[PDB]
Design a protein around this ligand. Structure first.
Ligand SMILES: *[C@@H]1O[C@H](CO)[C@@H](O[C@@H]2O[C@H](CO)[C@@H](O)[C@H](O)[C@H]2NC(C)=O)[C@H](O[C@@H]2O[C@@H](C)[C@@H](O)[C@@H](O)[C@@H]2O)[C@H]1NC(C)=O
Ligand SMILES: *[C@@H]1O[C@H](CO)[C@@H](O[C@@H]2O[C@H](CO)[C@@H](O)[C@H](O)[C@H]2NC(C)=O)[C@H](O[C@@H]2O[C@@H](C)[C@@H](O)[C@@H](O)[C@@H]2O)[C@H]1NC(C)=O
Ligand SMILES: *[C@@H]1O[C@H](CO)[C@@H](O[C@@H]2O[C@H](CO)[C@@H](O)[C@H](O)[C@H]2NC(C)=O)[C@H](O[C@@H]2O[C@@H](C)[C@@H](O)[C@@H](O)[C@@H]2O)[C@H]1NC(C)=O
Ligand SMILES: *[C@@H]1O[C@H](CO)[C@@H](O[C@@H]2O[C@H](CO)[C@@H](O)[C@H](O)[C@H]2NC(C)=O)[C@H](O[C@@H]2O[C@@H](C)[C@@H](O)[C@@H](O)[C@@H]2O)[C@H]1NC(C)=O
Ligand SMILES: CC(=O)N[C@H]1[C@@H](O[C@H]2[C@@H](O)[C@@H](CO)O[C@@H](O[C@H]3[C@H](O)[C@@H](O)[C@@H](O)O[C@@H]3CO)[C@@H]2O)O[C@H](CO)[C@H](O)[C@@H]1O
Ligand SMILES: CC(=O)N[C@H]1[C@@H](O[C@H]2[C@@H](O)[C@@H](CO)O[C@@H](O[C@H]3[C@H](O)[C@@H](O)[C@@H](O)O[C@@H]3CO)[C@@H]2O)O[C@H](CO)[C@H](O)[C@@H]1O
Ligand SMILES: [Ca+2]
Ligand SMILES: [Ca+2]
Ligand SMILES: [Mn+2]
Ligand SMILES: [Mn+2]
Lengths: 236, 237
């Protein structure tokens, strides 16, 4: 059982995507997770984008878990250096039919009033009380308090290539971050048992958020654009 | 305890390096693991390069294992597409004071006569009876029959950037291969317990080999050059 999709660019009204909150597809084909007005990113923004169809990560009959690989390119432009950009974007896996969670440092995937399980890879740009120096890549399981973290230097407004790979036989989730214009490479990996934290069917996608009003800073913002995205999963 | 070294280039007669067999440092400073005469790679070649000083990967007293990260760039030029280039290069970890093993598909690290333990990451270009489609990255533990492998497409004569990282806490060995001119990225990882396969002190380095004469093909060859190399390791306590 193999499922896969590829997006070289994005089209307005793409029927295979489910856009939520502020997420929208620009005219020149980029998926803008968070709000940008007249070329300027705004604060108090949150948006998600999910693949329209659910994917099966494991089968309770056979007990088998899927292996998958997804690659995407994103760009984060931070026009206002002072006082601090926020908040970041993530790639996540969650039960189907979920609603956008809290914004800010919760990236829009965590909902305290009614938490749902999730596995996510974050590209965190704002340092909350629970965070190590930013920016950093982090692996999150049911919480934004990462199990593993690695710092990285952002290519402001540049293109970033990401590769996320999960091997069921070893339970290893490894992600690679590359900034071609700088030639830098960042790698992080950890063990995660999907069967143990997620249901048989899930949704995959992205979620991002800009500065929360509580911070009283309109400069706490940046863009969170997704340029392309391909996904592939295999359940034996 | 933290050890590390960085070679942004290679000098003739590198005091910090121990060259074996065909390995040699060119005039323009690249480390040529296998023989190349007048700009042409030859068959029947094998060479290794080890960091002169041994490194401690684990301590029997504390039971602690080290974490490490190594980055290097290499280039493999395949002048003769037919009938098949060979054999590939590897980065390996082995007990100190070992001798070059068999060439060919054994890369010069495996010795059937008297086998010694080793952990290696291979960049295999010839398909032996025990191999999947080539080229591929492979993780080898005491054998060239990889535990895990992933295929990749070579940038002939181009530059390749490699990042190998080992985290003791999870026992995860993850390697990343990138070809900047093509923008391609390959990743592979697996679990390896160093403490369980290697001695407390080891040697780290590279080894490569070209077509073995038994194949009766002088075209079974290619270059195996290392452009730069940095290593780092933290053994807490
Ligand atoms: C942050 O964004 C939210 C969503 O865009 C704002 O809430 C929505 O604001 C609309 C415009 O005023 C209003 O029609 C909607 O009812 C409201 N949604 C609800 C029910 O929460 C949120 O705050 C609102 O908008 C600002 C401009 C003020 O007018 C507030 O009084 C509203 O509640 C935004 N945060 C702020 C206060 O900037
Ligand atoms: C929010 O971003 C603004 C634009 O980046 C900051 O203003 C800019 O501050 C620069 C100083 O580093 C100055 O050269 C620019 O001309 C100015 N641009 C504009 C259009 O405002 C702003 O900084 C605050 O406001 C400015 C006017 C000064 O009073 C600064 O001392 C203030 O810090 C940023 N606000 C914050 C909270 O940092
Ligand atoms: C493959 O490379 C070998 C080097 O590791 C060659 O070994 C030969 O070893 C001899 C013993 O010391 C030495 O005199 C020779 O110079 C050297 N090769 C030559 C001729 O330069 C091996 O050469 C073949 O095998 C040896 C034992 C002799 O019979 C040579 O005449 C053969 O050419 C190389 N094999 C091939 C097929 O080229
Ligand atoms: C070993 O590599 C050689 C160089 O690529 C091959 O020879 C070259 O083959 C080309 C077409 O395949 C031909 O246009 C070139 O002129 C020729 N170059 C030379 C110097 O020979 C060689 O291919 C075969 O063997 C050679 C000797 C010729 O007879 C070719 O016509 C053959 O295809 C490669 N060896 C093999 C067996 O593939
Ligand atoms: C959880 C979350 O969404 N957090 C937001 C938030 O972050 C906090 C920080 O900005 C922090 C730094 O001073 O300030 C907090 O709020 C202030 C508050 O405004 C004051 O009245 C007083 O209570 O002090 C606290 C801090 O101690 C913010 O909640 O905002 C930033 C944007 O600037 C990010 O969006 C975080 O994700
Ligand atoms: C063991 C080793 O290092 N392998 C070399 C070797 O690989 C074999 C293949 O090239 C294979 C292709 O036909 O041929 C083998 O040898 C022949 C032998 O010469 C014949 O007489 C007959 O017995 O069949 C066998 C194989 O069936 C080679 O051992 O050579 C290649 C060079 O192209 C590589 O260097 C491998 O690493
Ligand atoms: Ca954060
Ligand atoms: Ca091989
Ligand atoms: Mn974080
Ligand atoms: Mn192999």
């Amino acid at each position: 059982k193999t499922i896969s999709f590829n997006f070289n660019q994005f089209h307005q009204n793409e029927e295979q995507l489910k856009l939520q909150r502020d997420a929208r597809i620009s005219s020149n084909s980029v998926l803008e997770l968070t709000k940008v007005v007249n070329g300027v990113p705004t604060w108090n923004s949150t948006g998600r984008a999910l693949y329209a169809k659910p994917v099966q990560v494991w089968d309770s009959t056979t007990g088998n878990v899927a292996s998958f690989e997804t690659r995407f390119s994103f760009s984060i432009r931070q026009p206002f250096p002072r006082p601090h950009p926020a908040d970041g974007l993530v790639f996540f896996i969650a039960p189907p039919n979920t609603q956008t969670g809290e914004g800010g440092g919760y990236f829009g995937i965590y909902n305290p009033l009614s938490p749902y399980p999730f596995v996510a890879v974050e590209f965190d740009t704002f340092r909350n009380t629970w965070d190590p120096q930013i920016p950093h890549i982090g692996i999150d399981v049911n919480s934004v308090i990462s199990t593993k973290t690695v710092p990285f230097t952002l290519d402001n407004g540049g293109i970033a290539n990401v590769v996320i790979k999960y091997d069921a036989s070893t339970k290893i989730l490894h992600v690679v971050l590359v900034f071609p214009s700088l030639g830098t490479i960042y790698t992080i990996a950890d063990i995660v048992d999907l069967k143990q934290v997620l249901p048989e069917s899930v949704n995959v996608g992205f979620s991002a958020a800009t500065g929360d009003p509580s911070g009283k800073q309109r400069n706490a913002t940046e863009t969170h654009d997704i340029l392309s995205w391909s996904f592939s999963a295999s359940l034996p």
